[PDB]
């Protein structure tokens, strides 16, 4: 009833999910000429040393690499955040062509893809309760450009053949998400939403300034995934991004001058 196809894409989502036209929707365009440095901000604290990855799942929209979130094993703190946010999953949004695929844009530039590391605020006890709160989630977004390979992505690439179609999963232990980060943790932040239905306005977005590079071969393997289930007509999993939404009464703050 929702997807990225010819008849159920982002422009239709409002019919089932009227908050699609809400006041704090994501993604947005990040205008680097109007975002303002905020000295109240602190450095990010990314603490992933004890991360426990479990599984990778093709959910028909993207794939999620899932983590054990039943203890403070992989947490995000600092920055704009108060309290402790636990990593639950990461996933990507990507294009059919190297010139589109990201959800956020920077001065209207689209990247080839965007990585989302999704975290929930431990004060709310579980993910499902967290998404009902304005400060329930923190999503660390990282742009991908095509250039050099990202070595730390390759284990994800090489399992994709085992999860080609919707509903397939595979064991995915011992993956280190630190290998997906750029060098700098400089960031932009703003209040927004989930970028898929139910589009809840529960996210503090933290979007890194520095992209990571992935190879053309790595991206091509993402583009072999399927939206469909096994035994259904093949629909390549590409262009699983929502376009920029109106900023409305929000300000984007920068952690850097």
> Binding site membership: which residues?
91, 93, 116, 195-196
**Cβ of residue 178: shortest distance to Ni ion, in angstroms?**
19
Residue 44 · residue 208 · CB < 8 Å:
no
Find, among 180, 172, 158, the residue nearest to 224 by Cα: 158
Query: In this complex, which beta carbon is closest to Ni ion, that of residue 8 or of residue 38?
Result: 8
Query: In this complex, which beta carbon is closest to Ni ion, that of residue 116 or of residue 150?
Result: 116
Residues that bind Ni ion (CB under 5 A): 1, 116
**Cβ of residue 45: shortest distance to Ni ion, in angstroms?**
22
Query: In this complex, which beta carbon is closest to Ni ion, that of residue 110 or of residue 116?
Result: 116
* Residue nearest Ni ion by beta-carbon distance: 1
**Cβ of residue 148: shortest distance to Ni ion, in angstroms?**
24
State yes or no: is 61 an active-site residue: yes
**Cβ of residue 36: shortest distance to Ni ion, in angstroms?**
25
- Listing DSSP states for 54-70 in one string gives EEEEE-SSSEEEEE--S
Query: In this complex, which beta carbon is closest to Ni ion, that of residue 24 or of residue 116?
Result: 116
Q: Residue 220: which H helix or E strand, with range?
A: helix 216-222
**Paired tokens of 131:** 């998404």
- Spell out a b/e string for 83-116, using b for 16 or more CB atoms within 10 Å of the CB, else e: ebbbbbbbbbbbbeebebbbbbbbeeebbbbbbb
**Paired tokens of 160:** 């994709």
Which residues carry out catalysis? 61
């Amino acid at each position: 009833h929702w997807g990225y196809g010819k008849h159920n894409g982002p422009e239709h989502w409002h019919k089932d999910f009227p908050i699609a036209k809400g006041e704090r929707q994501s993604p947005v365009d990040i205008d680097t000429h109007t975002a303002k440095y905020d000295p109240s901000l602190k450095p990010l604290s990314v603490s992933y040393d004890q991360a426990t990855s479990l599984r990778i799942l093709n959910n028909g929209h993207a794939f999620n690499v899932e983590f054990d979130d039943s203890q403070d094993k992989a947490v995000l703190k600092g920055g704009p955040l108060d309290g402790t946010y636990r990593l639950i999953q990461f996933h990507f949004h990507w294009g059919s062509l190297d010139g589109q695929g990201s959800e956020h844009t920077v001065d209207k530039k689209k990247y080839a893809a965007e990585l989302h590391l999704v975290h929930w605020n431990t004060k709310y006890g579980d993910f499902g309760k967290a998404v009902q709160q304005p400060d329930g989630l923190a999503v660390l977004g990282i742009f991908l450009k095509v250039g050099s390979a990202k070595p730390g992505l390759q284990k994800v690439v090489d399992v994709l053949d085992s999860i080609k179609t919707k509903g397939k999963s595979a064991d995915f232990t011992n993956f280190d998400p630190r290998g997906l980060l750029p060098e700098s943790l400089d960031y932009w932040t703003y209040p927004g939403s989930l970028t898929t239905p139910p589009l809840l306005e529960c996210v503090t977005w933290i979007v890194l300034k520095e992209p990571i590079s992935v190879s053309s071969e790595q991206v091509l393997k993402f583009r072999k995934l399927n939206f469909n289930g096994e035994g259904e007509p093949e629909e390549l999993m590409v262009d699983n991004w929502r376009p920029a939404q109106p900023l409305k009464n929000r300000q984007i703050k920068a952690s850097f001058k």
